[PDB]
From Swiss-Prot, chain A:
Keywords: DNA damage, DNA recombination, DNA repair, DNA replication, DNA-binding. The keyword DNA repair applies. Residues 3-102 form the SSB domain. This is Single-stranded DNA-binding protein. Homotetramer. One of its GO terms (cellular component) is nucleoid. The keyword DNA damage applies.
UniProtKB/Swiss-Prot annotation, chain B:
Residues 3-99 form the SSB domain. It comes from the Bacteria. One of its GO terms (cellular component) is nucleoid. The keyword DNA damage applies. The lineage of its organism: Bacteria, Pseudomonadati, Pseudomonadota, Gammaproteobacteria, Pseudomonadales. Homotetramer. One of its GO terms (biological process) is DNA recombination. Plays an important role in DNA replication, recombination and repair. Binds to ssDNA and to an array of partner proteins to recruit them to their sites of action during DNA metabolism. GO terms for molecular function: enzyme activator activity; single-stranded DNA binding. Keywords: DNA damage, DNA recombination, DNA repair, DNA replication, DNA-binding. This is Single-stranded DNA-binding protein.
Curated annotation (Swiss-Prot), chain C:
The keyword DNA damage applies. Plays an important role in DNA replication, recombination and repair. Binds to ssDNA and to an array of partner proteins to recruit them to their sites of action during DNA metabolism. This is Single-stranded DNA-binding protein. Transmembrane segments: none annotated. It comes from the Bacteria. It comes from Pseudomonas aeruginosa (strain ATCC 15692 / DSM 22644 / CIP 104116 / JCM 14847 / LMG 12228 / 1C / PRS 101 / PAO1). GO terms for cellular component: nucleoid. Homotetramer. The keyword DNA damage applies. Keywords: DNA damage, DNA recombination, DNA repair, DNA replication, DNA-binding. One of its GO terms (biological process) is DNA recombination. GO terms for molecular function: enzyme activator activity; single-stranded DNA binding. Residues 2-96 form the SSB domain.
């Protein structure tokens, strides 16, 4: 009914973590930094990006710490009970068949 | 260094909450629902600043369909028990955009 | 690279739908977007495939729509070269009629 | 009223063309190739501070991210016939990021 779109150009924070489901489909997790400048100063936003499927395979193979990457996906907030029993929330950028990723540079 | 862009089309969840900061500028909070076809619904925490904050408080109501262009910002806060909490908000200020649709 | 156009605007007239030899549908509209600082930009939108049938069937003059696509500058011919930059909305794009409960 | 937004990532085709004008406004012109191998050529025009930055930092072959708005301008050719040129305008509402 609506539109849920995120566009990021940033730098991969760590070694991408790739995983596989029983069926063989790939899931790759990264953090992606984007930052702003300032004077009279730097604010960095750390985004949790999850790729699915083909893009997960490309991401897991070619991305490295410091990779500059374009990502188009959608926002998803996952709900989970912490070990102390209270609700927590995690907002991720989901990059699947409806999204896009381009390796830059 | 880099691009941080969110584009939403969705429906306001409730009447906007407008407040003001010591320096007088306006801050308006809303929740925005976006849904995809079975049906799944994402709830977004949207925060308007400055001029778009006044407009949003002025014209948005619990039903309104709205276009929002902003940036993601995960802010950290502390709960009742001194435990860390994080909330990722879509921040809409001079570099963003909001359009009431209809 | 990346080639992405995002429009919210009003359908300028009733869609034109045609069919290509292989039978696939192509629907042309014009989409008005404007800003006040007064100026209206008239976008040439071309839908392909499933969205073309949907667009021709359900969009009308004055419909408010969201469109996501890519820029394509098309060459045609007077004998002199002409060019039209179109927003191409096929399987990689998105179209949503706005409004609703 | 509506929304008019274009997001491109591509390579600058030629060396940017920058000119300054009386009011302090600068204008930079480039062509930008995106390919998906079919290549699409985009006319991109920067205004203001981004035109200054584009002229300083972009060169032929630079990879760049560009966010702007579509603008079609009308002109009469030297044969007297109407022609149209669609450009991506990158001004204060837009954005540019040199990549690589």
């Amino acid at each position: 009914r609506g539109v849920n779109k995120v566009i990021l150009v940033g730098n991969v924070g760590g070694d991408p973590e790739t995983r596989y489901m029983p069926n063989g489909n790939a899931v790759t997790n990264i953090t992606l930094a984007t930052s702003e400048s300032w004077k009279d100063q730097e604010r960095t936003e750390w985004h949790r990006v999850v790729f699915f499927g083909r893009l997960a395979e490309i991401a897991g193979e070619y991305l490295r710490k410091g990779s500059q990457v374009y990502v188009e996906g959608s926002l998803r907030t996952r709900k989970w009970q912490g070990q102390d029993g209270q609700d927590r929330y995690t907002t991720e950028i989901v990059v699947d068949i409806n999204g896009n990723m381009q390796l830059l540079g």
